Every structure is written in structure tokens, then in C-alpha cells.
Homo-oligomer: A and B are copies of this chain.
Amino acid sequence: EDPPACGSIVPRREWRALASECRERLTRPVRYVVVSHTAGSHCDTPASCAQQAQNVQSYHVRNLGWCDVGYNFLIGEDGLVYEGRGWNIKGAHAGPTWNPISIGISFMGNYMNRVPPPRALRAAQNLLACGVALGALRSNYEVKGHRDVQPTLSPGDRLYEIIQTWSHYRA
């Protein structure tokens, strides 16, 4: 109903991110969301996840020489949403075709032979509600698996099976 109607998000400074150097912005409302999964180690405390997230960022910044973490948003299993590039800055997470037309959310961990916990899934679906509410996402936005637009296993077999159930998934 009300303007800032949403989202319990761990901001950058909180998980101690490096400064985002990125500039290329997105066009709202965004139509597409791509679900990814870091495929690496997985956390479950505000404390271990805030670490997790920061590793990840570091990797994409230092090793691959990028301007900030690939994703716009990372879901922890602590149940929290770790802020990535956010709703307005174009991601680097799913090919040159989808990055300027999608929001990229990554479950932190590896879900080929596991599921993220109930609450991880809530954080994210809620985050998407939040995104629509703020006009970042088109009301009828579609959700694609990462393997749906990239050669990849991401977002893992189990998690994929789950997002394929969602109201907004459009194969």
C-alpha cells in the first residue's frame, strides 16, 4: 500500500562491501529476473553470510576485474537479502542479452542436490514482491532460471525445480 512498502535488506556497508564502481543503469520497470546460484560454499548466519557475500564480491572485482559484484542481490540462508548491485544498476550475471533487461538474484550456495531453506525462499520471493511494489519490476515480470539463458547448471537442479513452480516463471 504505502511508498517504501518492503524489503528487509542487508545494505552493502553492513556486509562491508567494497565501493561499487559500476555506472551502467537499468530501465524500470524491469521485465525479467534471472535466478542464479553462486554454486560455491553456503552460509546460515547473518555473520557467515555477510562473509560469504563479501568473498563473492571480492572474486568478481579482483580476479575478474569487474566494477562490483555480478549480481544485483544475493539471498542468504540466514534468511536475509544481501544487497548487490541493487534495482537500478545493470548486473553482470547472465550474458549480454539479459543483463540490461533483468534483475539478477543469486542464492548463495549450491543446490544441485539440495534445497535452500524455507526462509531463504521467502526472502527472495518477498524481495520480488518488494521490487514490483517499488516499480523496479513490471507487475507481470517473468522469472527465468540461469540455465534458461546461459549454458549452466545454475541455479542448481533442486532450486531450479522450485523456481519452475513460481507464479512468475515463464519457461
A120-161 interface (Cβ within 8 A of B): 121-123, 125-126, 128-129, 133, 135, 138-140, 148-153
Is the beta-carbon distance between A65 and B126 smaller than 8 angstroms? no
Is the beta-carbon distance between B65 and A139 smaller than 8 angstroms? yes
Counting contact residues on chain A (CB < 8 A from B), the size range is 35 or more
Give the contacting residue for A4; candidates B21, B39, B122; CB below 8 A.
B122
Is the beta-carbon distance between A60 and B151 smaller than 8 angstroms? yes
Q: How long is the Cα–Cα vector from A95 to B149 in the complex, in angstroms?
A: 13
**A-side interface mostly:** loop
Give the contacting residue for A45; candidates B46, B128, B152; CB below 8 A.
B46
A61 to chain B, nearest CB (A): 11
Contact residues of A with B, CB < 8 Å?
A: 1-10, 14, 21, 23-24, 27, 31-32, 38-40, 44-47, 59-60, 63-65, 67, 70, 78-80, 93, 95-97, 100-101, 118-119, 121-123, 125-126, 128-129, 133, 135, 138-140, 148-153, 167, 170
Beyond A14-B118, A24-B170, 13 extra complex contacts between A and B, CB < 8 Å = A3-B167, A4-B129, A5-B126, A7-B8, A8-B119, A8-B122, A8-B126, A9-B122, A21-B31, A39-B153, A45-B45, A46-B119, A100-B167
